[PDB]
Amino acid sequence: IPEKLEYFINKYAEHSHDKWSMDKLANGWIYGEIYSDSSKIQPLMLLSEKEKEIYRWPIKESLKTMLAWDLHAMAEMMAENYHNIWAKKKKLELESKGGGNHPLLVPYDTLTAKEKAKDREKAQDIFKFLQISGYVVSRGXXXXXXXXXXXXXXXXXXXXXXXXXXX
């Protein structure tokens, strides 16, 4: 967790709160200490105290996985991680309670398009702000290099062929 990114974590939390605030003001949500959903009353204006920071909490974790592991590649990797952490939590709790089988207990290359889009949404939401702030991020000529490698392989093969022709 870099220091300047640690500073930006709070500001991005505030900006995401403001975006959700625009959404909740479009919907209709007024502050009120009483907890309800059909009365359209919530004390953080249905996001509760901890629920307001549930999405803020793994932003730092996404940053740590970014450092420990181009743009579309980062998006797909963050989507894979966002679904993988939930899959690990779900498999742990289901092994704990001996519950039913979830159709999401499958490798990420098999999931339905909607299940990947759900986490890709949050991934792009967190990525666009990193892009606006000037953070150049990647995963961490090509054809000419491939041709050169092929030439080297051919040289090795030619050495072998010379050895064979000598015999």
GROMACS .gro file of N, CA and C in nm:
model
  501
    1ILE      N    1   0.083  -0.119   0.000
    1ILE     CA    2   0.000   0.000   0.000
    1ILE      C    3   0.087   0.125   0.000
    2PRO      N    4   0.111   0.181  -0.118
    2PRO     CA    5   0.192   0.304  -0.127
    2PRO      C    6   0.125   0.420  -0.057
    3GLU      N    7   0.207   0.517  -0.016
    3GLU     CA    8   0.158   0.628   0.066
    3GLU      C    9   0.062   0.717  -0.012
    4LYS      N   10   0.100   0.756  -0.134
    4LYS     CA   11   0.013   0.842  -0.214
    4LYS      C   12  -0.116   0.769  -0.253
    5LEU      N   13  -0.105   0.641  -0.285
    5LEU     CA   14  -0.226   0.563  -0.311
    5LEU      C   15  -0.308   0.545  -0.184
    6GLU      N   16  -0.242   0.536  -0.068
    6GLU     CA   17  -0.315   0.532   0.058
    6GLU      C   18  -0.393   0.661   0.080
    7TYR      N   19  -0.335   0.775   0.043
    7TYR     CA   20  -0.408   0.901   0.045
    7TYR      C   21  -0.526   0.897  -0.051
    8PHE      N   22  -0.505   0.843  -0.171
    8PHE     CA   23  -0.611   0.843  -0.272
    8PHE      C   24  -0.723   0.745  -0.237
    9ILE      N   25  -0.697   0.649  -0.148
    9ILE     CA   26  -0.801   0.553  -0.111
    9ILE      C   27  -0.921   0.623  -0.050
   10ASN      N   28  -0.897   0.716   0.043
   10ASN     CA   29  -1.007   0.787   0.107
   10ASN      C   30  -1.082   0.874   0.007
   11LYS      N   31  -1.010   0.940  -0.084
   11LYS     CA   32  -1.076   1.025  -0.182
   11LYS      C   33  -1.159   0.943  -0.279
   12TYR      N   34  -1.110   0.826  -0.319
   12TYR     CA   35  -1.190   0.740  -0.406
   12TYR      C   36  -1.311   0.684  -0.333
   13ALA      N   37  -1.296   0.651  -0.205
   13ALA     CA   38  -1.411   0.611  -0.125
   13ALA      C   39  -1.516   0.721  -0.124
   14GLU      N   40  -1.471   0.845  -0.106
   14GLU     CA   41  -1.564   0.958  -0.106
   14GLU      C   42  -1.631   0.975  -0.242
   15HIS      N   43  -1.555   0.958  -0.350
   15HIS     CA   44  -1.612   0.975  -0.484
   15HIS      C   45  -1.713   0.865  -0.516
   16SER      N   46  -1.683   0.741  -0.478
   16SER     CA   47  -1.779   0.633  -0.497
   16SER      C   48  -1.903   0.654  -0.411
   17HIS      N   49  -1.884   0.707  -0.290
   17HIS     CA   50  -1.999   0.743  -0.207
   17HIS      C   51  -2.083   0.850  -0.273
   18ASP      N   52  -2.019   0.946  -0.341
   18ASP     CA   53  -2.093   1.051  -0.410
   18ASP      C   54  -2.168   0.996  -0.531
   19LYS      N   55  -2.108   0.901  -0.603
   19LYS     CA   56  -2.177   0.839  -0.715
   19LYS      C   57  -2.299   0.760  -0.668
   20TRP      N   58  -2.281   0.677  -0.565
   20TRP     CA   59  -2.395   0.607  -0.506
   20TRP      C   60  -2.495   0.706  -0.447
   21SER      N   61  -2.448   0.825  -0.407
   21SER     CA   62  -2.538   0.927  -0.356
   21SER      C   63  -2.624   0.985  -0.468
   22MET      N   64  -2.566   1.006  -0.585
   22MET     CA   65  -2.646   1.047  -0.700
   22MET      C   66  -2.749   0.940  -0.734
   23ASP      N   67  -2.708   0.813  -0.729
   23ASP     CA   68  -2.803   0.705  -0.757
   23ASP      C   69  -2.915   0.700  -0.653
   24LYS      N   70  -2.882   0.717  -0.525
   24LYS     CA   71  -2.983   0.706  -0.420
   24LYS      C   72  -3.072   0.829  -0.416
   25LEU      N   73  -3.023   0.944  -0.464
   25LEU     CA   74  -3.111   1.060  -0.474
   25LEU      C   75  -3.201   1.050  -0.596
   26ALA      N   76  -3.154   0.983  -0.701
   26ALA     CA   77  -3.243   0.950  -0.812
   26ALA      C   78  -3.353   0.854  -0.766
   27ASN      N   79  -3.317   0.756  -0.683
   27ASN     CA   80  -3.417   0.660  -0.635
   27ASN      C   81  -3.512   0.724  -0.535
   28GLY      N   82  -3.459   0.800  -0.439
   28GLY     CA   83  -3.536   0.855  -0.329
   28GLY      C   84  -3.497   0.791  -0.197
   29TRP      N   85  -3.411   0.859  -0.120
   29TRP     CA   86  -3.360   0.806   0.006
   29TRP      C   87  -3.326   0.924   0.097
   30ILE      N   88  -3.398   0.936   0.208
   30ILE     CA   89  -3.377   1.044   0.304
   30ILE      C   90  -3.322   0.984   0.433
   31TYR      N   91  -3.235   1.060   0.499
   31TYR     CA   92  -3.173   1.014   0.623
   31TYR      C   93  -3.278   0.994   0.731
   32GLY      N   94  -3.264   0.886   0.807
   32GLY     CA   95  -3.353   0.856   0.918
   32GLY      C   96  -3.301   0.742   1.003
   33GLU      N   97  -3.296   0.763   1.135
   33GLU     CA   98  -3.232   0.667   1.224
   33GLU      C   99  -3.300   0.530   1.220
   34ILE      N  100  -3.429   0.526   1.187
   34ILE     CA  101  -3.501   0.400   1.184
   34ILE      C  102  -3.460   0.320   1.061
   35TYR      N  103  -3.435   0.190   1.081
   35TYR     CA  104  -3.396   0.101   0.974
   35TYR      C  105  -3.519   0.042   0.907
   36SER      N  106  -3.530   0.062   0.775
   36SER     CA  107  -3.641   0.007   0.699
   36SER      C  108  -3.605   0.011   0.551
   37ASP      N  109  -3.685  -0.061   0.472
   37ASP     CA  110  -3.672  -0.064   0.326
   37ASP      C  111  -3.800  -0.028   0.254
   38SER      N  112  -3.916  -0.070   0.307
   38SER     CA  113  -4.044  -0.032   0.249
   38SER      C  114  -4.086   0.108   0.289
   39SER      N  115  -4.032   0.161   0.398
   39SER     CA  116  -4.056   0.298   0.440
   39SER      C  117  -3.960   0.397   0.376
   40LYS      N  118  -3.864   0.348   0.297
   40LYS     CA  119  -3.766   0.432   0.228
   40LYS      C  120  -3.689   0.521   0.326
   41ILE      N  121  -3.650   0.464   0.439
   41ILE     CA  122  -3.579   0.536   0.544
   41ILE      C  123  -3.454   0.458   0.581
   42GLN      N  124  -3.339   0.525   0.578
   42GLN     CA  125  -3.210   0.467   0.612
   42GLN      C  126  -3.126   0.572   0.684
   43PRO      N  127  -3.044   0.531   0.780
   43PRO     CA  128  -2.968   0.628   0.860
   43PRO      C  129  -2.837   0.674   0.797
   44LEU      N  130  -2.808   0.637   0.673
   44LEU     CA  131  -2.685   0.677   0.605
   44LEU      C  132  -2.717   0.736   0.469
   45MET      N  133  -2.819   0.821   0.465
   45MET     CA  134  -2.862   0.883   0.340
   45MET      C  135  -2.841   1.034   0.345
   46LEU      N  136  -3.012   0.137   0.079
   46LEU     CA  137  -3.029   0.053   0.197
   46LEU      C  138  -2.895   0.021   0.262
   47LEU      N  139  -2.794   0.101   0.228
   47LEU     CA  140  -2.659   0.077   0.276
   47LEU      C  141  -2.650   0.111   0.424
   48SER      N  142  -2.618   0.011   0.507
   48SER     CA  143  -2.604   0.031   0.650
   48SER      C  144  -2.466   0.089   0.680
   49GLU      N  145  -2.431   0.095   0.809
   49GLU     CA  146  -2.301   0.145   0.851
   49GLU      C  147  -2.188   0.066   0.787
   50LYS      N  148  -2.180  -0.063   0.819
   50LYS     CA  149  -2.075  -0.147   0.763
   50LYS      C  150  -2.095  -0.168   0.613
   51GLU      N  151  -2.221  -0.172   0.569
   51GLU     CA  152  -2.250  -0.193   0.427
   51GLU      C  153  -2.200  -0.077   0.342
   52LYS      N  154  -2.191   0.043   0.400
   52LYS     CA  155  -2.141   0.157   0.324
   52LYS      C  156  -1.993   0.141   0.293
   53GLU      N  157  -1.919   0.073   0.379
   53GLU     CA  158  -1.776   0.053   0.360
   53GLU      C  159  -1.739  -0.086   0.310
   54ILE      N  160  -1.837  -0.176   0.290
   54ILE     CA  161  -1.804  -0.308   0.235
   54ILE      C  162  -1.728  -0.296   0.103
   55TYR      N  163  -1.771  -0.204   0.015
   55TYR     CA  164  -1.706  -0.193  -0.115
   55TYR      C  165  -1.577  -0.112  -0.106
   56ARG      N  166  -1.567  -0.023  -0.007
   56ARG     CA  167  -1.443   0.051   0.014
   56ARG      C  168  -1.332  -0.038   0.067
   57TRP      N  169  -1.367  -0.138   0.149
   57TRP     CA  170  -1.264  -0.221   0.213
   57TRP      C  171  -1.172  -0.292   0.115
   58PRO      N  172  -1.219  -0.361   0.010
   58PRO     CA  173  -1.126  -0.435  -0.076
   58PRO      C  174  -1.061  -0.351  -0.185
   59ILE      N  175  -1.076  -0.218  -0.183
   59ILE     CA  176  -1.002  -0.135  -0.278
   59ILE      C  177  -0.852  -0.144  -0.250
   60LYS      N  178  -0.814  -0.132  -0.123
   60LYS     CA  179  -0.675  -0.150  -0.086
   60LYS      C  180  -0.627  -0.291  -0.119
   61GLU      N  181  -0.714  -0.392  -0.102
   61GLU     CA  182  -0.676  -0.529  -0.134
   61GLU      C  183  -0.654  -0.546  -0.284
   62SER      N  184  -0.739  -0.483  -0.366
   62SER     CA  185  -0.718  -0.483  -0.510
   62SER      C  186  -0.586  -0.418  -0.545
   63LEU      N  187  -0.552  -0.309  -0.477
   63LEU     CA  188  -0.421  -0.246  -0.498
   63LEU      C  189  -0.307  -0.340  -0.461
   64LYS      N  190  -0.321  -0.413  -0.349
   64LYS     CA  191  -0.216  -0.504  -0.306
   64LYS      C  192  -0.198  -0.619  -0.404
   65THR      N  193  -0.309  -0.673  -0.457
   65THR     CA  194  -0.297  -0.777  -0.559
   65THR      C  195  -0.238  -0.721  -0.688
   66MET      N  196  -0.272  -0.596  -0.722
   66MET     CA  197  -0.208  -0.528  -0.834
   66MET      C  198  -0.057  -0.525  -0.818
   67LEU      N  199  -0.009  -0.486  -0.700
   67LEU     CA  200   0.136  -0.478  -0.679
   67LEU      C  201   0.200  -0.616  -0.672
   68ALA      N  202   0.130  -0.714  -0.614
   68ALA     CA  203   0.189  -0.845  -0.593
   68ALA      C  204   0.186  -0.933  -0.718
   69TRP      N  205   0.100  -0.903  -0.814
   69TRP     CA  206   0.092  -0.982  -0.936
   69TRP      C  207   0.184  -0.926  -1.044
   70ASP      N  208  -0.303  -0.475  -2.173
   70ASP     CA  209  -0.252  -0.425  -2.045
   70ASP      C  210  -0.366  -0.380  -1.954
   71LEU      N  211  -0.442  -0.279  -1.999
   71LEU     CA  212  -0.553  -0.229  -1.919
   71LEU      C  213  -0.669  -0.328  -1.918
   72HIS      N  214  -0.704  -0.382  -2.034
   72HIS     CA  215  -0.804  -0.488  -2.039
   72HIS      C  216  -0.757  -0.611  -1.963
   73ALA      N  217  -0.626  -0.638  -1.966
   73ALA     CA  218  -0.572  -0.750  -1.889
   73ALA      C  219  -0.588  -0.727  -1.740
   74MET      N  220  -0.561  -0.605  -1.693
   74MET     CA  221  -0.582  -0.574  -1.552
   74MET      C  222  -0.729  -0.583  -1.516
   75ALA      N  223  -0.817  -0.540  -1.608
   75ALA     CA  224  -0.960  -0.549  -1.583
   75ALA      C  225  -1.005  -0.694  -1.566
   76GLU      N  226  -0.961  -0.782  -1.657
   76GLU     CA  227  -1.002  -0.922  -1.648
   76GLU      C  228  -0.940  -0.990  -1.526
   77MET      N  229  -0.815  -0.956  -1.492
   77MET     CA  230  -0.756  -1.014  -1.372
   77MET      C  231  -0.828  -0.969  -1.245
   78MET      N  232  -0.867  -0.841  -1.240
   78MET     CA  233  -0.940  -0.793  -1.122
   78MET      C  234  -1.079  -0.854  -1.116
   79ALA      N  235  -1.142  -0.876  -1.231
   79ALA     CA  236  -1.270  -0.947  -1.234
   79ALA      C  237  -1.254  -1.090  -1.182
   80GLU      N  238  -1.150  -1.159  -1.228
   80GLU     CA  239  -1.122  -1.294  -1.181
   80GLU      C  240  -1.100  -1.297  -1.030
   81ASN      N  241  -1.025  -1.200  -0.977
   81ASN     CA  242  -1.000  -1.195  -0.834
   81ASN      C  243  -1.127  -1.164  -0.756
   82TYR      N  244  -1.208  -1.070  -0.806
   82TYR     CA  245  -1.332  -1.034  -0.739
   82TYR      C  246  -1.427  -1.152  -0.731
   83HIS      N  247  -1.432  -1.234  -0.837
   83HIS     CA  248  -1.516  -1.353  -0.829
   83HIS      C  249  -1.451  -1.463  -0.747
   84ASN      N  250  -1.318  -1.470  -0.747
   84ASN     CA  251  -1.249  -1.578  -0.677
   84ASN      C  252  -1.259  -1.562  -0.526
   85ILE      N  253  -1.249  -1.439  -0.476
   85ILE     CA  254  -1.259  -1.418  -0.332
   85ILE      C  255  -1.399  -1.456  -0.283
   86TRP      N  256  -1.502  -1.418  -0.359
   86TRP     CA  257  -1.638  -1.457  -0.323
   86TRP      C  258  -1.657  -1.608  -0.332
   87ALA      N  259  -1.596  -1.671  -0.433
   87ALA     CA  260  -1.606  -1.816  -0.445
   87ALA      C  261  -1.538  -1.886  -0.328
   88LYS      N  262  -1.424  -1.834  -0.284
   88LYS     CA  263  -1.356  -1.893  -0.168
   88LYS      C  264  -1.440  -1.878  -0.042
   89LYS      N  265  -1.496  -1.759  -0.020
   89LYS     CA  266  -1.583  -1.739   0.096
   89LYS      C  267  -1.702  -1.834   0.092
   90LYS      N  268  -1.765  -1.847  -0.026
   90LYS     CA  269  -1.883  -1.932  -0.039
   90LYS      C  270  -1.848  -2.079  -0.018
   91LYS      N  271  -1.736  -2.125  -0.074
   91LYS     CA  272  -1.698  -2.265  -0.057
   91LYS      C  273  -1.661  -2.293   0.088
   92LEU      N  274  -1.596  -2.198   0.155
   92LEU     CA  275  -1.563  -2.216   0.296
   92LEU      C  276  -1.690  -2.227   0.381
   93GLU      N  277  -1.786  -2.136   0.360
   93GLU     CA  278  -1.906  -2.141   0.442
   93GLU      C  279  -1.989  -2.266   0.411
   94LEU      N  280  -1.991  -2.309   0.285
   94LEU     CA  281  -2.070  -2.428   0.251
   94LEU      C  282  -2.005  -2.554   0.306
   95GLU      N  283  -1.872  -2.560   0.307
   95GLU     CA  284  -1.805  -2.671   0.375
   95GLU      C  285  -1.829  -2.666   0.526
   96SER      N  286  -1.843  -2.546   0.582
   96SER     CA  287  -1.867  -2.533   0.726
   96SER      C  288  -2.007  -2.580   0.764
   97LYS      N  289  -2.109  -2.537   0.690
   97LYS     CA  290  -2.247  -2.568   0.727
   97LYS      C  291  -2.303  -2.692   0.657
   98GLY      N  292  -2.228  -2.755   0.568
   98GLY     CA  293  -2.277  -2.870   0.496
   98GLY      C  294  -2.400  -2.839   0.413
   99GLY      N  295  -2.398  -2.726   0.343
   99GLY     CA  296  -2.511  -2.680   0.266
   99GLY      C  297  -2.511  -2.736   0.125
  100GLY      N  298  -2.591  -2.672   0.040
  100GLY     CA  299  -2.609  -2.718  -0.096
  100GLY      C  300  -2.495  -2.677  -0.188
  101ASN      N  301  -2.501  -2.731  -0.310
  101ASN     CA  302  -2.401  -2.703  -0.411
  101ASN      C  303  -2.441  -2.580  -0.491
  102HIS      N  304  -2.348  -2.487  -0.504
  102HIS     CA  305  -2.366  -2.363  -0.577
  102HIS      C  306  -2.318  -2.380  -0.721
  103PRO      N  307  -2.396  -2.339  -0.821
  103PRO     CA  308  -2.352  -2.356  -0.960
  103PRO      C  309  -2.230  -2.272  -0.996
  104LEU      N  310  -2.187  -2.186  -0.903
  104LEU     CA  311  -2.069  -2.102  -0.923
  104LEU      C  312  -1.942  -2.169  -0.873
  105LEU      N  313  -1.949  -2.294  -0.828
  105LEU     CA  314  -1.831  -2.366  -0.782
  105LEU      C  315  -1.759  -2.430  -0.900
  106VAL      N  316  -1.727  -2.349  -1.000
  106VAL     CA  317  -1.663  -2.395  -1.123
  106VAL      C  318  -1.554  -2.296  -1.162
  107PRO      N  319  -1.455  -2.341  -1.240
  107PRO     CA  320  -1.350  -2.249  -1.284
  107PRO      C  321  -1.406  -2.130  -1.360
  108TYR      N  322  -1.331  -2.019  -1.356
  108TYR     CA  323  -1.380  -1.893  -1.410
  108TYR      C  324  -1.399  -1.897  -1.561
  109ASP      N  325  -1.333  -1.989  -1.631
  109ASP     CA  326  -1.348  -2.001  -1.776
  109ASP      C  327  -1.473  -2.079  -1.817
  110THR      N  328  -1.563  -2.105  -1.723
  110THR     CA  329  -1.688  -2.176  -1.750
  110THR      C  330  -1.811  -2.095  -1.713
  111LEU      N  331  -1.796  -1.990  -1.631
  111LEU     CA  332  -1.908  -1.914  -1.579
  111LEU      C  333  -1.992  -1.854  -1.692
  112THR      N  334  -2.115  -1.817  -1.657
  112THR     CA  335  -2.202  -1.746  -1.750
  112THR      C  336  -2.156  -1.602  -1.764
  113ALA      N  337  -2.193  -1.540  -1.876
  113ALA     CA  338  -2.145  -1.405  -1.907
  113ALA      C  339  -2.189  -1.303  -1.803
  114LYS      N  340  -2.308  -1.323  -1.745
  114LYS     CA  341  -2.359  -1.226  -1.648
  114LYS      C  342  -2.279  -1.228  -1.518
  115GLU      N  343  -2.235  -1.347  -1.475
  115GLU     CA  344  -2.159  -1.357  -1.351
  115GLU      C  345  -2.024  -1.287  -1.363
  116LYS      N  346  -1.964  -1.290  -1.483
  116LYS     CA  347  -1.839  -1.218  -1.504
  116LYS      C  348  -1.864  -1.069  -1.520
  117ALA      N  349  -1.976  -1.032  -1.583
  117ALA     CA  350  -2.007  -0.890  -1.600
  117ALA      C  351  -2.032  -0.823  -1.466
  118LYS      N  352  -2.090  -0.896  -1.370
  118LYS     CA  353  -2.119  -0.838  -1.239
  118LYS      C  354  -1.993  -0.789  -1.170
  119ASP      N  355  -1.885  -0.867  -1.175
  119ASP     CA  356  -1.761  -0.824  -1.111
  119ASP      C  357  -1.681  -0.731  -1.202
  120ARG      N  358  -1.695  -0.747  -1.334
  120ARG     CA  359  -1.629  -0.655  -1.427
  120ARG      C  360  -1.680  -0.513  -1.407
  121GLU      N  361  -1.807  -0.498  -1.368
  121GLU     CA  362  -1.861  -0.366  -1.338
  121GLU      C  363  -1.779  -0.296  -1.230
  122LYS      N  364  -1.767  -0.359  -1.113
  122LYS     CA  365  -1.689  -0.301  -1.004
  122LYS      C  366  -1.543  -0.283  -1.044
  123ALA      N  367  -1.489  -0.378  -1.121
  123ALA     CA  368  -1.350  -0.366  -1.166
  123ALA      C  369  -1.329  -0.239  -1.246
  124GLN      N  370  -1.414  -0.215  -1.346
  124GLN     CA  371  -1.400  -0.094  -1.427
  124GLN      C  372  -1.427   0.031  -1.345
  125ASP      N  373  -1.521   0.024  -1.251
  125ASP     CA  374  -1.549   0.137  -1.163
  125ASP      C  375  -1.424   0.178  -1.086
  126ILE      N  376  -1.349   0.080  -1.034
  126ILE     CA  377  -1.229   0.115  -0.958
  126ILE      C  378  -1.113   0.149  -1.052
  127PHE      N  379  -1.117   0.099  -1.176
  127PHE     CA  380  -1.004   0.120  -1.267
  127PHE      C  381  -1.007   0.259  -1.330
  128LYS      N  382  -1.127   0.311  -1.358
  128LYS     CA  383  -1.135   0.439  -1.427
  128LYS      C  384  -1.074   0.551  -1.343
  129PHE      N  385  -1.090   0.545  -1.211
  129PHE     CA  386  -1.033   0.648  -1.125
  129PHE      C  387  -0.881   0.637  -1.118
  130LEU      N  388  -0.828   0.514  -1.118
  130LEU     CA  389  -0.684   0.497  -1.129
  130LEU      C  390  -0.633   0.554  -1.261
  131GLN      N  391  -0.713   0.543  -1.367
  131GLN     CA  392  -0.671   0.596  -1.496
  131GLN      C  393  -0.673   0.749  -1.497
  132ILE      N  394  -0.772   0.810  -1.431
  132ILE     CA  395  -0.782   0.956  -1.431
  132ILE      C  396  -0.667   1.018  -1.353
  133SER      N  397  -0.618   0.948  -1.251
  133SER     CA  398  -0.515   1.003  -1.163
  133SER      C  399  -0.374   0.992  -1.221
  134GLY      N  400  -0.359   0.935  -1.340
  134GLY     CA  401  -0.228   0.924  -1.401
  134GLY      C  402  -0.147   0.804  -1.359
  135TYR      N  403  -0.212   0.700  -1.307
  135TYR     CA  404  -0.144   0.577  -1.266
  135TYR      C  405  -0.140   0.483  -1.385
  136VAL      N  406  -0.024   0.474  -1.450
  136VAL     CA  407  -0.005   0.381  -1.560
  136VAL      C  408   0.019   0.242  -1.502
  137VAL      N  409  -0.075   0.151  -1.527
  137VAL     CA  410  -0.072   0.017  -1.469
  137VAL      C  411  -0.077  -0.085  -1.581
  138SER      N  412  -0.004  -0.195  -1.563
  138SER     CA  413  -0.004  -0.306  -1.657
  138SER      C  414  -0.011  -0.436  -1.577
  139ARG      N  415   0.014  -0.548  -1.645
  139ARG     CA  416   0.010  -0.677  -1.577
  139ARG      C  417   0.133  -0.696  -1.489
  140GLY      N  418   0.251  -0.669  -1.542
  140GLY     CA  419   0.374  -0.683  -1.467
  140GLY      C  420   0.413  -0.827  -1.443
  141UNK      N  421   1.040  -0.531  -3.248
  141UNK     CA  422   0.901  -0.573  -3.259
  141UNK      C  423   0.883  -0.718  -3.213
  142UNK      N  424   0.762  -0.751  -3.170
  142UNK     CA  425   0.732  -0.886  -3.122
  142UNK      C  426   0.744  -0.988  -3.234
  143UNK      N  427   0.695  -0.952  -3.353
  143UNK     CA  428   0.702  -1.040  -3.469
  143UNK      C  429   0.848  -1.064  -3.508
  144UNK      N  430   0.927  -0.957  -3.504
  144UNK     CA  431   1.070  -0.967  -3.536
  144UNK      C  432   1.141  -1.056  -3.434
  145UNK      N  433   1.103  -1.042  -3.307
  145UNK     CA  434   1.161  -1.124  -3.201
  145UNK      C  435   1.126  -1.271  -3.221
  146UNK      N  436   1.002  -1.297  -3.260
  146UNK     CA  437   0.957  -1.433  -3.288
  146UNK      C  438   1.035  -1.492  -3.405
  147UNK      N  439   1.055  -1.411  -3.509
  147UNK     CA  440   1.131  -1.452  -3.626
  147UNK      C  441   1.275  -1.485  -3.587
  148UNK      N  442   1.334  -1.403  -3.501
  148UNK     CA  443   1.470  -1.424  -3.454
  148UNK      C  444   1.482  -1.552  -3.372
  149UNK      N  445   1.381  -1.578  -3.289
  149UNK     CA  446   1.377  -1.700  -3.209
  149UNK      C  447   1.367  -1.822  -3.299
  150UNK      N  448   1.285  -1.810  -3.403
  150UNK     CA  449   1.270  -1.916  -3.502
  150UNK      C  450   1.403  -1.940  -3.572
  151UNK      N  451   1.475  -1.832  -3.602
  151UNK     CA  452   1.605  -1.841  -3.667
  151UNK      C  453   1.707  -1.912  -3.577
  152UNK      N  454   1.701  -1.882  -3.447
  152UNK     CA  455   1.790  -1.946  -3.350
  152UNK      C  456   1.761  -2.096  -3.340
  153UNK      N  457   1.632  -2.129  -3.337
  153UNK     CA  458   1.589  -2.269  -3.335
  153UNK      C  459   1.637  -2.340  -3.461
  154UNK      N  460   1.628  -2.270  -3.574
  154UNK     CA  461   1.674  -2.322  -3.702
  154UNK      C  462   1.824  -2.344  -3.701
  155UNK      N  463   1.897  -2.256  -3.633
  155UNK     CA  464   2.042  -2.269  -3.620
  155UNK      C  465   2.078  -2.393  -3.539
  156UNK      N  466   2.004  -2.415  -3.431
  156UNK     CA  467   2.023  -2.534  -3.348
  156UNK      C  468   1.996  -2.661  -3.430
  157UNK      N  469   1.885  -2.657  -3.504
  157UNK     CA  470   1.846  -2.768  -3.590
  157UNK      C  471   1.950  -2.791  -3.699
  158UNK      N  472   2.012  -2.684  -3.746
  158UNK     CA  473   2.115  -2.692  -3.849
  158UNK      C  474   2.241  -2.756  -3.792
  159UNK      N  475   2.272  -2.724  -3.667
  159UNK     CA  476   2.384  -2.788  -3.599
  159UNK      C  477   2.360  -2.938  -3.591
  160UNK      N  478   2.239  -2.974  -3.549
  160UNK     CA  479   2.199  -3.114  -3.541
  160UNK      C  480   2.208  -3.183  -3.677
  161UNK      N  481   2.162  -3.113  -3.781
  161UNK     CA  482   2.162  -3.166  -3.917
  161UNK      C  483   2.303  -3.184  -3.970
  162UNK      N  484   2.393  -3.094  -3.934
  162UNK     CA  485   2.533  -3.105  -3.972
  162UNK      C  486   2.595  -3.226  -3.905
  163UNK      N  487   2.562  -3.244  -3.777
  163UNK     CA  488   2.608  -3.361  -3.702
  163UNK      C  489   2.559  -3.490  -3.768
  164UNK      N  490   2.435  -3.488  -3.815
  164UNK     CA  491   2.374  -3.604  -3.879
  164UNK      C  492   2.436  -3.633  -4.016
  165UNK      N  493   2.461  -3.528  -4.093
  165UNK     CA  494   2.517  -3.540  -4.227
  165UNK      C  495   2.663  -3.584  -4.221
  166UNK      N  496   2.731  -3.547  -4.113
  166UNK     CA  497   2.869  -3.590  -4.092
  166UNK      C  498   2.875  -3.741  -4.077
  167UNK      N  499   2.773  -3.798  -4.015
  167UNK     CA  500   2.765  -3.942  -3.994
  167UNK      C  501   2.715  -4.012  -4.121
   0.00000   0.00000   0.00000
